[model samples]
Target chain A: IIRKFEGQNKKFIIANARVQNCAIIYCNDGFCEMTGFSRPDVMQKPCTCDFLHGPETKRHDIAQIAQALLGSEERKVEVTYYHKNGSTFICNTHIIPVKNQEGVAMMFIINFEYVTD
Target chain B: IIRKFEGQNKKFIIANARVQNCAIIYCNDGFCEMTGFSRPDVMQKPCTCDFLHGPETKRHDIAQIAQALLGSEERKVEVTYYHKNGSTFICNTHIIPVKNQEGVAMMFIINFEYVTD
Candidate 1:
C-alpha cells in the first residue's frame, strides 16, 4: 500500500521519519531529485531539517515545528530549503504526526512541494 | 498572515477545524469553489466529512482520521468527496493538528486537492 501510494504521486516528494529521534526512515525518488541528494545521502543524515535549513532560515517556522513535534501536533509552513548544489527554493511542507494504535507519536509523514512565485 | 498564505495558494482548498469537536472554523474560497458549496453552507455544517462522505465511503480512512484526531496525530489519505450537486470526486486530503504555544492540539488544518484521473 505504501509503495502504491508513493508510486502514484510523481510530482510531490514524500518522506517519513522517526519521531523519537528525527531520523529519516524513508524518502521517495522525488525527494532525491528535488534536493539533488541521493537516497543514501538523505538517509544517512540525522534529520532532513539539519541538511535542508540554512543558517539564514527563519527561526519562527522552525520554532513552530519544534513546538508541534514536542506536543505531537501537526504543522504546515513555507520555508527555504537548500539543494545539494547550494541552490535554494521555497517549499510548502506539511508535517503529519503518525501515531501508534496506543496513541503514541511514533513517526511523522512529511510531504513537500515546491512553490513557484 | 493567514490571508497572505491563502491568497498564494489558488489551486488548493484550505480548511481549519476545532480539534475538540471537529467543527469547521474557517475555509478559504478555494474550498467553496471546489466542493460546489458556499462558505456559509460549509461553515454551517458540523464537519466536512459529514457532507463529503457517503454511505459507501470507506471506513478504513475514516477510522484512521478518528484515530489521528483522538490521538492528536497527523494523517493523509485519498478519499472520495461529494459535491453539492451530488457528483463525487477523489481528493487528497492532508490533516494537520495545529497546536498552541502550550503545545496542546487546539485545532486542525486540513488541505484538500482534487486528484486528477
Candidate 2:
C-alpha cells in the first residue's frame, strides 16, 4: 500500500531514500524538494539531523522511525521532520526493506511525505 | 507496516473508517475525535460529502484513493479529508481487503492516522 502512494503521488510532494551505512541516499527527487535541499546536498549525508530529524528531534517520531526500521518488510511510520527552512513538517514514511541476493538486508527504502495544509 | 503506527500511538490522536454503500463508518474512538463527529452521526453517513470531501477535494488525492481501493493487499495512500467541522486533515489510510473462508472479499480492514504537529 505504501508503494502505491509513492507511485501515484510521484508528481506531487513525496520523499524517498535508500539507507546505506550512516547515510540515507536519496533515490528520488521528491525527497530533495520536501526537505528544501538539492539532490547533491542530500546525497551521501546521514539521514540524521541534516536531512532528517534525529535525537534532538521529536521523541515520539524518533521512536517511530526506530520501530519501523527494525520491523519486518513493508512497515510504515508517520514522523515529524524539520524542513530545510527550519519549519516543522509531518512526514509519512513507508519503510521497505531491500535485501541482497543472499536474503541479507542491504538497504532500507523509505517513502517520505508531508501533509499540505 | 502501517499497522505499527496504529498500535504504538493508540493513545494519541488518530483517525480510522471504512466506506460503505453511501457512508464511512468509524470503528474506533480516535476517528470520532479526529473528525469531531459522534459515532452515531458518522455511522450511517456515506463517506461522500460530509466526512470526506468530494469534488474539489484535490484531484490529486482523489485519484490516490481510487488507486488504493482497487489495489491489492497492503496498499496505502495519503489524502486530504474534510472533517465534520470543515477543517482539512491529511490521512494516511492503509486499506487491507479481508477475505472470507470461500476466498471471497468480505470487508476492508483500514488503519488510518493523522500527522501530529
Candidate 3:
C-alpha cells in the first residue's frame, strides 16, 4: 500500500477493516520524513485532519456516510486525509459498522485506498 | 457502456447482473460489424472466448471464482475478455451470489467494468 521514490519509501498506508479510535496502527517512514515529525508525533494524534489543511474532503460525502450509518446502511465514499507534512491526499474509502453478535455496531471500520489523477 | 469513433461507434458493453444462460443481453452494432458476424451469429454462442485467439485470462482466477461459488462465498475478480476483432481486453469484474429469502443462491450476479492499459 506504500510506494517509494527513492529507496524503500513508504508513501501510503491502508487498512482492510474499519479502524476504531485508532488501534493497531503504523506509519510509513516516508510519512515521518516528509512531515518532519517522528512516528511518535503521529501516534499521539490519530485524526487525519491534522495533516490535511486544504479542501481535500467533501462535506456531502461525510453527510451521506453519517446518514447511512444512522439508518443502518452500508456506505463508501472518497475523503481527504492529511499527511504529516501538511499536504492533503484523496482516498477512496469505505466505512462499515462493526457489529456485535446482537447486530449492534460497537465500532466503526475504515478501509482506505489512495486515489491518484 | 458504448463508445463511438467517427460519427458514432459503440466500443463497449457492460452489465451489473449475472448472465444466467445469457439472458437479457445486447451487443452493439460495432461488435457485429467488427467480427464480420451478424448479431444472430453471436447470439448463437454466449461465450466471449470465440474472439480470443491468443493467451488471455488467468486460470487461477477462474479456479478461485469456482471455489468461491461452490463454497457460497461472495467474490470479485478481473479477467480477460475478447473483442470481436481477435483482440483481448481485461475487465475488472465483481461476481456476487444472489440469494433468496432462504439465504440460498438461486442465481449469480456479475458486475463488470472495462480496464484499459
Candidate 4:
C-alpha cells in the first residue's frame, strides 16, 4: 500500500497506500493537497487516501496512468482541477516507465510541475 | 508480500506469499526444495512464500539478509541442508545489495553456486 511521501516543507511522511481515492497508494503528503484536504481527515481506514487538486501537473487517473506507464502504452493528459473554495489549477507531467523488472512492479518517473499562476 | 519467483526448470511461477513457514515471501519454484515440499502446498494465503533448501547456495535468513543488504551489515552464512532421502547439499553465495532507492525496496545481487558436488 501507500507509505511515505514528500510535501510542504519537503519532508517525507509515512502512511498507508491502498484501494481508495482516500487510500492514496503512495505519493507526496503535500501532493495530497489535490484532494482538498491536506490530511486524510476522513479515513479511519486503509491506504487509498484522498488527494488535493491545486495548480500542478496533470495526467490521467490512476488506472489510466499505470496503464500508460506500467504497460507498453504511453499517453498523456491534462487534468484541470477545481477546489472546494472555487479555485482552479492545471497540471502537466511527463510520465516514463522505468523498466520491466524481475523483482517488482512498474515504476513511473514523472516530472511534475506548476506551469503558470 | 511475495508474488513472483523462479526455480525448477529455471522458470518463474506466480503465487501468494505470506505468513507461516509455508507462506514464504517470494523465491524459487525449485527453491522450495528446502522445505521438503516442491510446493508451498500448505499456503492458501498472501505473499510470503516458502523456499527450498537443497544444494544451491547459502546465506542468512530473511531478517538477517535484508538487514545486511537492506541496511549496511554485510556478513555471510552457510546453511547445511539435509533432504528426506538423506541427501545433503551445501550452498555458497555472494550476497550484495544493489542500492538505496526512492523507487523501491533494496535489491539483492546474489551469485549462488553449488561448491563441490
Best by TM-score: 1
Each candidate's chain B TM-score?
0.79, 0.64, 0.53, 0.38
* CAPRI level of candidate 1: incorrect
- Identify the runs in model 3 with alpha carbons over 4 angstroms from their true place: A1-117, B1-54
**Which TM-score does chain B of candidate 1 obtain?**
0.79
Q: Each model's DockQ?
A: 0.02, 0.01, 0.01, 0.06
Instruction: List native contact recovery per candidate, as a fraction of 1.
Output: 0.00, 0.00, 0.00, 0.00
Alpha-carbon lDDT, every model: 0.60, 0.50, 0.45, 0.35
Predictions: Cα RMSD each: 16.7, 19.1, 18.9, 9.4
Instruction: Give per-residue CA lDDT, model 2, range B1-117, as digits (tens).
Output: 223333343211111222235233223355666767776666545333235674446877766655554443446667777777777777776666433333333334466667553
| lDDT measured at residue B54 in model 2 versus the true structure, 0 to 100 | 45
Query: lDDT for model 1, on a 0 to 1 scale?
Result: 0.60
Question: Which ranges of candidate 1 are over 4 A from the true structure?
Answer: A1-5, A10-19, B1-117
Tens digits of lDDT, candidate 1, B1-117: 222325344323222333345766455556778888876677634444567787656788777756776666777878877888888888877766654334445445576778885
My TM-score estimates for the predictions, one after another, are 0.44, 0.39, 0.32, 0.35
- Cα lDDT tens digits, model 3, A43-66, are 424323234344665677666655
lDDT of 2 by residue, A45-83 (tens): 554334667444677767666665555355666666777
**iRMS of candidate 4, Å:** 11.0
Tens digits of per-residue lDDT for model 3, B35-104: 4456555542432323333467677766665566565466776777666666766765555443433454
Q: Which stretches of candidate 4 lie over 4 Å from their true place?
A: A1-25, A33-71, A75-78, A82-86, A98-111, B1-64, B69-117
Candidate 4 chain A: worst-modelled 10 consecutive residues by lDDT: A1-10
What would the TM-score be for candidate 2 when compared with the true structure? Answer: 0.39
lDDT of 1 by residue, A5-115 (tens): 243442222223333567654555567788787866776344435677876567887777667767767778888778888888888777766554345554455667788
